[PDB]
Amino acid sequence: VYYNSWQNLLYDSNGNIIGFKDFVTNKTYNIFPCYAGRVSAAFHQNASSLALLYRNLKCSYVLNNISLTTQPYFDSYLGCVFNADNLTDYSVSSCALRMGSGFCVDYNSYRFVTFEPFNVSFVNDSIES
């Protein structure tokens, strides 16, 4: 509703264009940047392939808008993981491929597993006097 008769471009504080009104149709659009980002690749010297993490992307978005691949995939907490088996039920006390938030990539194929470096010592003695 903000475009007056002499106005056709919406700018931010930095001087990027972020919206416009089309001179022919008078339709109004917001402009958003196309997605840009890195791939976090985990590699082990004893392996022939990478485990790939697309941080904060759901696998449907990666496959539809970035690239199709033949590799198996799943939606982990950190984002879409390719070429690793979802085994967060399993746990490891040491990890060379630390992904964040207590998740680790382990290699035998790759596994995506939880990192739990410390334990409590347990005894079966009574708590009560």
Partner 1 sequence: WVTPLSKRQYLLKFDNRGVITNAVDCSSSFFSEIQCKTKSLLPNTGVY
Partner 2 sequence: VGGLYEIKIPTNFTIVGQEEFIQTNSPKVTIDCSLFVCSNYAACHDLLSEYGTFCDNINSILDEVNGLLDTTQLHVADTLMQGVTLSSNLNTNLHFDVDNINFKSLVGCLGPHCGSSSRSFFEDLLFDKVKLSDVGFVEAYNNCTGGSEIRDLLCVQSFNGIKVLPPILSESQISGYTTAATVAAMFPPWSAAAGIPFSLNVQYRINGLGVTMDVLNKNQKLIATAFNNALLSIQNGFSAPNSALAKIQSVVNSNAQALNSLLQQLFNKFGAISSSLQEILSRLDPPEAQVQIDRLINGRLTALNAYVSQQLSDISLVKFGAALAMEKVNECVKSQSPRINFCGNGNHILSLVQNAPYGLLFMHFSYKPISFKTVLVSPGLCISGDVGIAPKQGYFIKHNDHWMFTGSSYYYPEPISDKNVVFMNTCSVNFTKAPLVY
Ligand X SMILES: *[C@@H]1O[C@H](CO)[C@@H](O)[C@H](O)[C@H]1NC(C)=O
Ligand Y SMILES: *[C@@H]1O[C@H](CO)[C@@H](O[C@@H]2O[C@H](CO)[C@@H](O)[C@H](O)[C@H]2NC(C)=O)[C@H](O)[C@H]1NC(C)=O
Question: Footprint of partner 2 on this chain (CB under 8 A)?
Answer: 12, 14-15, 18, 30, 33, 35-38, 55-58, 61, 77-78, 98, 100-102, 115-127
Q: Does 75 bind ligand Y (CB under 6 A)?
A: yes
Residues 12-31, one symbol each (x = binds ligand Y by CB under 6 A, - = not), give -------------xx-----
Q: Does 1 bind partner 1 (CB under 8 A)?
A: yes
Cβ 49 vs Cβ 83: under 8 Å: yes
The size of the chain, in residues, is: 129
Looking at the chain, after which residues does the C atom sit over 2.5 Å from the next written N, breaking the chain? 108
Residues 77-96, one symbol each (x = binds ligand X by CB under 6 A, - = not), give ----------------x---
**Calpha distance 78→19 (Å, rounded):** 32
Q: Does 91 bind ligand Y (CB under 6 A)?
A: no
Cβ 95 vs Cβ 103: under 8 Å: no
Residues 2-21, one symbol each (x = binds partner 1 by CB under 8 A, - = not), give x-x--x--------------
**Comparing C-alpha atoms, which of 79, 76, 86, 74 is closest to residue 111?**
86
